[PDB]
């Protein structure tokens with residue numbers, strides 16, 4: 001996160017850190033708890049990932065230093081990638097992780113609500129991007145979960161900012177015209193959380209941008225409201 005500040009413990013209880021175990025253990029991507037055995041994240045996180053066996057999901061983490069060999073985690077039973085996904089810049093950048101065990105909900109780990117189909121017509125004015133990613137292009141993963149408040153940008157304005165790309169309504173953009181606040185390397189897969197009528201909604205999944213926090217380069221997120229039926233198809237399968 002560029003231009004953010006330290007989160008407080010329990011502030012983003014749906015935020016997870018997804019770690020890879022091969023060749024050595026390290027943070028891979030962010031993610032969001034959406035159900036007691038479900039993590040919603042970005043499809044591009046699994047590039048080269050040949051098996052769910054190398055994945056570890058940690059919930060209830062403020063600091064990456066809380067993670068050692070004796071720290072409990074959730075194993076991943078299955079990686080579900082949207083089957084229209086090709087690359088982050090073309091959209092469909094969404095994936096689900098089916099956990100091997102159930103998350104016990106508490107004040108440290110709980111799910112974020114998905115947006116409603118009717119809420120597609122609502123204007124969100126209180127949106128935050130969170131993660132352990134870089135503070136600038138050449139940096140390192142941060143120990144403490146960071147947060148940054150960012151305004152949503154219309155599809156028309158985002159398309160103006162990305163000449164040469166096709167910004168679809170399945171993407172949602174966020175950033176200041178002058179830049180300064182954004183997601184950066186290591187934040188992808190994490191949430192873009194918006195508070196509406198005292199309820200937090202998972203509005204976006206951190207996907208891509210041209211550089212980090214640059215002037216007139218909004219962050220591009222998977223527009224979660226456009227995938228509610230796809231998520232329900234995969235998580236509510238009979």
Ligand SMILES: COC(=O)Nc1ccc2c(c1)N[C@@H](C(F)(F)F)CCCC[C@H](NC(=O)/C=C/c1cc(Cl)ccc1-n1cnnn1)c1ncc-2[nH]1
Nearest residue numbers: 026027028141183184185186187188207208209211219220
């Ligand atoms: C010690 O642990 C470690 O250093 N972990 C570590 C470190 C860095 C990484 C990473 C793991 N993840 C990638 C990989 F390949 F390293 F595993 C996979 C994932 C590959 C893509 C990922 N993209 C983002 O996270 C966000 C991009 C992004 C999103 C928005 Cl909304 C705006 C601007 C953006 N940026 C433009 N340029 N940079 N950001 C990333 N790139 C490097 C990493 N992640």
